[PDB]
Design an enzyme around this catalytic site. Sequence first.
Site, mmCIF file in Angstrom:
data_model
loop_
_atom_site.group_PDB
_atom_site.id
_atom_site.type_symbol
_atom_site.label_atom_id
_atom_site.label_comp_id
_atom_site.label_asym_id
_atom_site.label_seq_id
_atom_site.Cartn_x
_atom_site.Cartn_y
_atom_site.Cartn_z
ATOM 1 N N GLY A 191 0.741 -1.241 0.000
ATOM 2 C CA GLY A 191 0.000 0.000 0.000
ATOM 3 C C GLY A 191 0.783 1.312 0.000
ATOM 4 N N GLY B 273 2.384 2.596 -2.356
ATOM 5 C CA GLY B 273 2.271 3.230 -3.657
ATOM 6 C C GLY B 273 3.323 2.837 -4.682
ATOM 7 N N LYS B 274 3.850 1.621 -4.556
ATOM 8 C CA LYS B 274 4.862 1.126 -5.479
ATOM 9 C C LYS B 274 4.301 1.012 -6.896
ATOM 10 C CE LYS B 274 5.367 -2.647 -3.221
ATOM 11 N NZ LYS B 274 4.537 -2.352 -2.011
ATOM 12 N N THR B 275 3.156 0.355 -7.042
ATOM 13 C CA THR B 275 2.592 0.182 -8.370
ATOM 14 C C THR B 275 2.219 1.521 -8.980
ATOM 15 O OG1 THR B 275 1.639 -1.966 -7.639
ATOM 16 C CG2 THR B 275 0.986 -1.123 -9.794
ATOM 17 N N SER B 276 1.581 2.381 -8.190
ATOM 18 C CA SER B 276 1.193 3.706 -8.680
ATOM 19 C C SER B 276 2.423 4.458 -9.214
ATOM 20 C CB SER B 276 0.544 4.510 -7.566
ATOM 21 O OG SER B 276 -0.682 3.917 -7.181
ATOM 22 N N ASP C 39 2.008 -8.007 -8.841
ATOM 23 C CA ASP C 39 1.081 -8.065 -7.714
ATOM 24 C C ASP C 39 0.095 -9.232 -7.779
ATOM 25 O OD1 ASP C 39 0.753 -4.469 -6.998
ATOM 26 O OD2 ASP C 39 2.107 -6.040 -6.232
ATOM 27 N N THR D 102 -4.828 -2.182 -0.981
ATOM 28 C CA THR D 102 -3.889 -3.293 -0.852
ATOM 29 C C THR D 102 -3.937 -3.934 0.536
ATOM 30 O OG1 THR D 102 -2.428 -2.581 -2.663
ATOM 31 C CG2 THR D 102 -1.421 -3.957 -0.966
HETATM 32 N N1 LIG Z 1 0.632 10.090 -2.939
HETATM 33 C C1 LIG Z 1 -0.505 9.337 -3.091
HETATM 34 N N2 LIG Z 1 -1.619 10.066 -2.875
HETATM 35 C C2 LIG Z 1 -2.855 9.571 -2.942
HETATM 36 N N3 LIG Z 1 -3.037 8.281 -3.250
HETATM 37 C C3 LIG Z 1 -1.941 7.524 -3.461
HETATM 38 C C4 LIG Z 1 -0.642 7.925 -3.407
HETATM 39 N N4 LIG Z 1 0.137 6.813 -3.667
HETATM 40 C C5 LIG Z 1 -0.746 5.900 -3.811
HETATM 41 N N5 LIG Z 1 -2.036 6.181 -3.656
HETATM 42 C C6 LIG Z 1 -3.359 5.407 -3.811
HETATM 43 O O1 LIG Z 1 -3.153 4.309 -2.918
HETATM 44 C C7 LIG Z 1 -3.331 2.843 -2.992
HETATM 45 C C8 LIG Z 1 -1.929 2.519 -2.525
HETATM 46 O O2 LIG Z 1 -1.517 1.731 -3.644
HETATM 47 P P1 LIG Z 1 -0.460 1.259 -4.722
HETATM 48 O O3 LIG Z 1 0.376 1.991 -5.675
HETATM 49 O O4 LIG Z 1 -1.411 0.336 -5.412
HETATM 50 O O5 LIG Z 1 0.665 0.233 -4.238
HETATM 51 P P2 LIG Z 1 1.506 -0.893 -3.611
HETATM 52 O O6 LIG Z 1 0.561 -1.799 -2.914
HETATM 53 O O7 LIG Z 1 2.239 -1.520 -4.783
HETATM 54 O O8 LIG Z 1 2.435 -0.069 -2.703
HETATM 55 C C9 LIG Z 1 -4.081 3.030 -4.310
HETATM 56 O O9 LIG Z 1 -5.509 2.888 -4.077
HETATM 57 C C10 LIG Z 1 -3.606 4.400 -4.959
HETATM 58 O O10 LIG Z 1 -4.304 4.779 -6.172
HETATM 59 MG MG LIG Z 2 1.286 -2.989 -5.670
#
Ligand SMILES: Nc1ncnc2c1ncn2[C@@H]1O[C@H](COP(=O)(O)OP(=O)(O)O)[C@@H](O)[C@H]1O
Ligand SMILES: [Mg+2]
Length: 544
Positions: free
Chosen positions: A18, A20-23, A45, A457
């Site tokens: 959670g 934000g790796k994928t984002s 993932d 996540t």
């Molecule tokens: N700086 C940010 N601000 C707001 N939302 C974010 C930010 N980074 C991630 N998110 C939101 O947060 C969730 C965290 O997820 P995500 O990238 O999927 O990654 P992972 O599980 O690979 O770390 C998602 O629902 C996403 O769209």
């Molecule tokens: Mg992810």
Amino acid sequence: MQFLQNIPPYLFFTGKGGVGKTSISCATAIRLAEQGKRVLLVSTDPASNVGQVFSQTIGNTIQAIASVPGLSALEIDPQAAAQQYRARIVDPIKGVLPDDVVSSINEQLSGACTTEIAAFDEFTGLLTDASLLTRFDHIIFDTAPTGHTIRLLQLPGAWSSFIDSCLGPMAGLEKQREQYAYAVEALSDPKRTRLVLVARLQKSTLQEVARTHLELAAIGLKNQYLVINGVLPKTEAANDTLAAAIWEREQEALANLPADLAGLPTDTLFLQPVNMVGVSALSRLLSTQRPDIPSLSALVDDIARNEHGLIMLMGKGGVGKTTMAAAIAVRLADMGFDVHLTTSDPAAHLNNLQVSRIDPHEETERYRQHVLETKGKELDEAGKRLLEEDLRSPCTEEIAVFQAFSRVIREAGKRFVVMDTAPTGHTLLLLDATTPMMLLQDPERTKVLLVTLPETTPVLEAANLQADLERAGIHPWGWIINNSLSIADTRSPLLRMRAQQELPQIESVKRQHASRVALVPVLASEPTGIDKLKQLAGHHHHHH
Ligand SMILES: Nc1ncnc2c1ncn2[C@@H]1O[C@H](COP(=O)(O)OP(=O)(O)O)[C@@H](O)[C@H]1O
Ligand SMILES: [Mg+2]
Ligand SMILES: Nc1ncnc2c1ncn2[C@@H]1O[C@H](COP(=O)(O)OP(=O)(O)NP(=O)(O)O)[C@@H](O)[C@H]1O
Ligand SMILES: [Cl-]
Ligand SMILES: [Cl-]
Ligand SMILES: [Cl-]
Ligand SMILES: [Cl-]
Ligand SMILES: [Mg+2]
């Protein structure tokens, strides 16, 4: 952004579920594409959502992402890969050995470790394929292998030794030793691979990152970058007291980054209003700027009904297990019952509550030591090192701490026993085959609580933990959703927009995951004092 300058062909992102790796991966994928670079995005993932964010389907084949030229994606399902890795070992003896044996062996290949080894097998495939760098300038992965997995595959003993534990997946690698070494070589070459640590401005998360960084560095990955995500912009701490509490807490941590991370090139990304879902929204990220769920007090009132029981709090790292476990124990005690809280981390601290602090470090060492007399016996030095690296697994602490806790599990009869961590279903099953499994499975005696966050996540990771616990016959009695902004007192526009993002997550939990649910708020003050600890609980109106 520094992390976007001079990226080598291989870029991996790592961090907790959670962060934000994928984002960030997706965001970078586009940035690079629009600079005219050919980019391969690799979703790794469990239940990939990269296709969705790009509004198309992706699969175990390289496909173009029509919504952004120059970019292509590929999905490597970890669950599917693990399934087939296990089948690749078990299928051959299926029908030659008894069923209960093939059955045990199969369980020995159903844990996190097998999944990690199998993911590494895919990473290696990609990393050792030169042609790809002929079709792409960059190959980006939204996850990264752990130091543990890397140590294991680099041990001479992994290839020359055999051991009478999670070493089972090792006999599944079918590639030659030379390819695994080549891969590790590529991951350690700053010229080919850049590692980006993703974190948050929370004193605790930074501690974990600093740790991952040292592990990966000693191993050889010295091309590391720090990306602090989701940072709260000061131009928001104005007016609303909650936002103000937060913004400080971060500026605090931000200013006191652990020593190790200090020397790391660092960038920070801003907390976004809506959870990204398109090229437009994703691109934004790289710039320069009430639900019908009862209070925790309601869960505790119902845990209080029997007036005794084993309360086990479970979940991923950092979701707040220890804090929920202290809140529950404190509440139970103020309700008049003898409560024995057990923690695996230093906290603090009426005479109705007794606290047992166990040091996982020494527990783990007693355990490791104990397994080195048993099994290490006839192994050679190289093999003992393989065995010591297996005992460096996440579950080793998990098992050791659970055996320490078990020391008191006896009292679950007279009173309440609250624990802040437990082994996984897979691990419980392994230990069972060798230890109160019956007690744990009994719904009257034990009440397993799953702590998670109102995010996409963390909910999936929690659902998966429950699924695993269920295979072991344990059914979580309820779920606790922590750090909620919905139930938070905030006039801050961004936090309100954020709180609105949680709704479907929280809704999922109540509609599809938990028999019972508890909603805790983002305190905006560290629940260090039993004062703020009592605040998390809220209040439960008495009824008949
Ligand atoms: N700086 C940010 N601000 C707001 N939302 C974010 C930010 N980074 C991630 N998110 C939101 O947060 C969730 C965290 O997820 P995500 O990238 O999927 O990654 P992972 O599980 O690979 O770390 C998602 O629902 C996403 O769209
Ligand atoms: Mg992810
Ligand atoms: N509701 C909350 N509001 C504000 N801060 C919180 C809340 N819950 C937890 N925290 C803080 O977040 C940190 C991490 O949570 P904690 O309760 O230690 O995690 P845990 O899941 O026991 N950790 P670990 O055993 O390391 O996985 C602590 O420093 C807390 O004070
Ligand atoms: Cl495991
Ligand atoms: Cl395993
Ligand atoms: Cl492993
Ligand atoms: Cl009541
Ligand atoms: Mg804890």
